[PDB]
């Protein structure tokens, strides 16, 4: 949404910002920096990542960098800027950006809370679980600027138990967190198939593309190679195919003809024959776009007496079955998939904390609000309520904050 801000230039710093972009670089004119205590900082109506479209009437949407500089520099003291936030995000996450963010102040308050007698976990949780992920990155930088020590290591020494797992998870970037969760699922004498399946089957092309790049920076090896080392059979083939994150992109046209042929091919390769043509299932379910496969699964029910999920339970077993069942759920209704996994992690005796924590951290800024709607509608009470009964202490409070609230 396009909005207007009035800045009064000061002779020191002018507007008090830095800008990047220009049609020379296929970018708009974006606010790079906002200098503390200067003209733009005092309005508190401007954010980094904002695109400057106009300045006192002069358009800037197709302006080069120098054109924008001359325009911003030559404007009078009273400046009217047309500004729009061109940074992408998600409207359905539960954790939003804090409106009084000072990375240095939060860094100091966390340092005092770490060094407070007995460790003040309450303020550590009340800060970190009420900041966005990139705000947590700024806090980590300011903490290392002030203390010359890494915030992650400092919190790893002050915290313990399930709270340490939550907090250390929130500090990592989403790619870093998924990359390290995948590594943790394959490291050791075995493979946490349920964790590897949950991440590989639920991430999008763009999320997987960054995971693959970040995974090699952190571990100097390719994720695909670690997958090949820890898996075998058709399960390896499916995981490697999905982890590539090269699924077709949702186009604007609906291929009704291919929808029917895919539905036939799924039927012919599965419950119509004895045995299963597993490659045919892997090819269709990993390469077609998600909106296409949702229509294929409805067309499948026209040929098959069992739906895609029921057919999987009749056709395959073990880790391959679990993978396909997870994949189809993510294709059909990803928020409901996480609502069900959250339920399973808490419904029974004790808690599957590793699963509960991973979902509450990774989806808090993606679709937690949709997960909560699916959860409440299906199970009758809220995700918040189930977290209350299953967790206690500061650990519970942190998860409640990541949940965002009731219903």
């Amino acid at each position: 949404q396009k909005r207007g801000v009035k800045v009064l230039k000061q002779e020191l710093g002018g507007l008090g910002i830095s800008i990047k972009g220009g049609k020379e670089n296929k970018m708009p004119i974006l606010i790079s920096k906002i200098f503390k205590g200067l003209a733009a900082d005092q309005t508190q109506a401007l954010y980094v990542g904002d695109a400057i479209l106009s300045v006192n009437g002069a358009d800037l949407r197709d302006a080069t960098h120098d054109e924008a500089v001359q325009a911003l520099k030559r404007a009078g003291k009273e400046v009217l800027l047309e500004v729009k936030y061109m940074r992408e995000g998600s409207a359905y996450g539960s954790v939003k950006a804090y409106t009084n963010f000072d990375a240095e102040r939060d860094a100091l308050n966390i340092e005092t809370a770490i060094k407070t007698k007995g460790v003040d976990e309450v303020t550590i949780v009340n800060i970190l679980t009420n900041r966005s992920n990139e705000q947590r990155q700024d806090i980590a930088f300011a903490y290392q600027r002030r203390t010359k020590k890494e915030l992650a290591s400092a919190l790893k020494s002050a915290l313990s138990g399930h709270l340490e797992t939550v907090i250390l998870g929130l500090l990592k970037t989403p790619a870093q967190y998924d990359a390290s969760e995948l590594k943790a699922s394959m490291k050791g004498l075995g493979t946490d198939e349920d964790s590897l399946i949950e991440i590989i089957c639920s991430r999008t092309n763009q999320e997987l593309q960054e995971i693959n790049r970040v995974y090699k920076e952190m571990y100097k090896t390719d994720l695909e190679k670690d997958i090949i080392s820890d898996t075998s059979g058709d399960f390896r083939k499916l995981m490697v195919a999905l982890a590539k994150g090269r699924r077709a992109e949702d186009g604007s046209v609906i291929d009704y003809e291919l929808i029917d042929q895919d539905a036939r091919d799924l039927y012919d390769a599965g419950v119509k024959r004895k045995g299963t043509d597993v490659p045919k299932w892997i090819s269709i379910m990993t390469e077609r776009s998600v909106p296409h496969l949702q229509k294929v699964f409805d067309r499948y029910k026209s040929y098959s007496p069992y739906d895609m999920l029921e057919s999987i339970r009749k056709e395959v077993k073990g880790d391959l079955e679990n993978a396909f069942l997870n994949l189809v759920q993510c294709i059909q209704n990803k928020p409901l998939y996480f609502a069900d996994r959250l339920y399973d992690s808490m419904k029974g005796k004790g808690t599957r904390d590793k699963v509960l924590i991973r979902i509450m951290v990774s989806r808090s800024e993606v679709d937690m609000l949709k997960i909560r709607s699916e959860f409440k509608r299906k199970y009758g009470k809220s995700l918040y309520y189930y977290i209350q009964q299953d967790t206690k202490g500061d650990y519970q409070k942190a998860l409640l904050y990541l949940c965002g609230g009731d219903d």
Binding site: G13, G14, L15, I17, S18, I19, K20, G21, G22, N25, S32, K33, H65, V69, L72, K73
Partner: peptide, 6 residues
Amino acid sequence: FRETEV
């Protein structure tokens, strides 16, 4: 990386 202060 092109960054100008105004």
